[PDB]
Write a structure and sequence with these properties.
The PDB classes it as immune system. The structure holds three protein chains of three kinds. By secondary structure, chain A is α+β, with helices and mostly antiparallel strands. Chain A has two helices and 13 strands, in the order ββββααβββββββββ. By secondary structure, chain B is mostly loops. The chains are: A alpha+beta, B little secondary structure, C alpha+beta.
C-alpha cells in the first residue's frame, strides 16, 4: 500500500564495459547520466529547469560498480548470467487517425543482460528520423524494461516493424505494426 | 537530487 | 558474440507511505539475477541474502560510520529527494484524452467491441467504467489494464462487448486525480 517509490538504479556489465546510472520514480525514468558525455540527461526537459544533479558523482558510483562486479565475478567462480529474452510489443501513443502525426512505441520487457540492438523498419528499410529511446529501466525481478519511439504519419500505405536483437533470442525478433 | 554512494565490496 | 556476460546492479529504493510519514529505504546489490546483500532501514543493518553476500554484510556492519549514514538516509536521502522532486513527480497530473469508437463497423444488433481509449494521462491511478442507458455494465468489459508509455504518460483501452440496439446510449466514464468531476464520453447507437 505504498504511495510512491523512488529508485536510484545502477549497473555495470562485463566484458562490454557498459554502465548505467539513473533515477526512477514509480517506474518512469526521471533522468540518467550519459556515460559518453558525462552529463545529466533529464527524461523530460522541464525537469532540468527545476532540479539539478551532479553528474560527476554518478561516474564515481560507476567506478565502484565496476569494482564490485569484478569481485563478485571471481567470488562466484565466474558464473555468467543466464540470458532472458525480451517480450516485445509495438503500439501507438494514441488512436490512429490517418495522415495525423502519431508515435509508434516499441515496448521491450522482462529481459537481461541489458544489451539490445533495436532498429525501426519502414517498409523493410531502416528509419532514424526523430527516433528516440529510454535507457534500461529497472524491474523488481531484476530484469530490464526499455522503450523505443518512432514519430510517424499514419497511412494505409506503409508497414512498420520494430526489429529487436538480444542474446537470449534465436533469431532477430520483428514486431509488426500496420493500420487496420 | 542527491545520490547514495556505492559501497565497495569486501575483498576476501 | 558468445562471450559469457557478468552483470552487477545496485539499487537504492525509497518507499513512501502516507506522504512522507512512513519511509522505508532498501539498498540492494544484485549479481546477475540474484540479490546478494541488502540494507533495509526497517532492519537497521546489512543482511546477506545469498551466501556470496556474507562477507560484505559482515564487513560493512563493522563500520559505525556507514551504519549511521545508512540509518539516517531515510531523512538525508529519501525525504530530501521526495521534497525537491515533489512538484514534478508526486504532484504531476495530466488529464486523459478520452475517445470512444466501435472496433469495427457492424450493423445494429450484431456483436461488437466498443472501445474507450483513455490516453496521455498521469498518474496511473484511474477508474474507467461503462454505462448502457445510464446503468453500469460490469460484464463484457475487456481491458488492457494500465499501459506505461515510458514518457511520463499512461494509456488504457477499456472495451465493451455490446449488442447495441436502436437508440441506445453508451457512456465511458473516467475518474482520475487530474479532474474534480468524472470525464464522460458518449456513443449513441444510430436510430433506425
Amino acid at each position: 500500500k505504498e504511495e510512491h517509490v523512488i529508485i536510484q538504479a545502477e549497473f555495470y556489465l562485463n566484458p562490454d564495459q557498459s554502465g548505467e546510472f539513473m533515477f526512477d520514480f514509480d517506474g518512469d525514468e526521471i533522468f540518467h547520466v550519459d556515460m559518453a558525455k558525462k552529463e545529466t540527461v533529464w527524461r523530460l526537459e522541464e525537469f532540468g529547469r527545476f532540479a539539478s544533479f551532479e553528474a560527476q558523482g554518478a561516474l564515481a558510483n560507476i567506478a565502484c560498480d565496476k569494482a564490485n562486479l569484478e569481485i563478485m565475478t571471481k567470488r562466484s567462480n565466474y558464473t555468467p548470467i543466464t540470458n532472458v529474452p525480451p517480450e516485445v510489443t509495438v503500439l501507438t501513443n494514441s488512436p490512429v487517425e490517418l495522415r495525423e502525426p502519431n508515435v509508434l512505441i516499441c515496448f521491450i520487457d522482462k529481459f537481461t543482460p541489458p544489451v539490445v540492438n533495436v532498429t525501426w523498419l519502414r517498409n523493410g528499410k531502416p528509419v532514424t528520423t526523430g527516433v528516440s529511446e529510454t535507457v534500461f529501466l529497472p524491474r523488481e525481478d531484476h530484469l530490464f524494461r526499455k522503450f523505443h519511439y518512432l514519430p510517424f504519419l499514419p497511412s494505409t500505405e506503409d508497414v512498420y516493424d520494430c526489429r529487436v536483437e538480444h542474446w537470449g533470442l534465436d533469431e532477430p525478433l520483428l514486431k509488426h505494426w500496420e493500420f487496420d | 537530487v542527491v545520490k547514495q554512494n556505492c559501497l565497495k565490496l569486501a575483498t576476501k | 558474440d558468445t562471450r559469457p556476460r557478468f552483470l552487477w546492479q545496485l539499487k537504492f529504493e525509497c518507499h513512501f507511505f502516507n506522504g512522507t510519514e512512513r519511509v522505508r529505504l532498501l539498498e540492494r546489490s544484485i549479481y546477475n539475477q540474484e540479490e546478494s546483500v541488502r540494507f533495509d532501514s526497517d532492519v537497521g543493518e546489512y543482511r546477506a541474502v545469498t551466501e556470496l553476500g556474507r562477507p560484505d554484510a559482515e564487513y560493512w556492519n563493522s563500520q559505525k560510520d556507514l551504519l549511521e549514514q545508512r540509518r539516517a538516509a531515510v531523512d538525508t536521502y529519501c525525504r530530501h529527494n521526495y521534497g525537491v522532486g515533489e512538484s514534478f513527480t508526486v504532484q504531476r497530473r495530466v488529464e486523459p484524452k478520452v475517445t470512444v469508437y466501435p472496433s469495427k463497423t457492424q450493423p445494429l444488433q450484431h456483436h461488437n467491441l466498443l472501445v474507450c481509449s483513455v490516453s496521455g494521462f498521469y498518474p496511473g491511478s484511474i477508474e474507467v467504467r461503462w454505462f448502457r442507458n445510464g446503468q453500469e455494465e460490469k460484464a463484457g468489459v475487456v481491458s488492457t489494464g494500465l499501459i506505461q508509455n515510458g514518457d511520463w504518460t499512461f494509456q488504457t483501452l477499456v472495451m465493451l462487448e455490446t449488442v447495441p440496439r436502436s437508440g441506445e446510449v453508451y457512456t465511458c466514464q473516467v475518474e482520475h486525480p487530474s479532474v474534480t468531476s468524472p470525464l464522460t464520453v458518449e456513443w449513441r447507437a444510430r436510430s433506425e
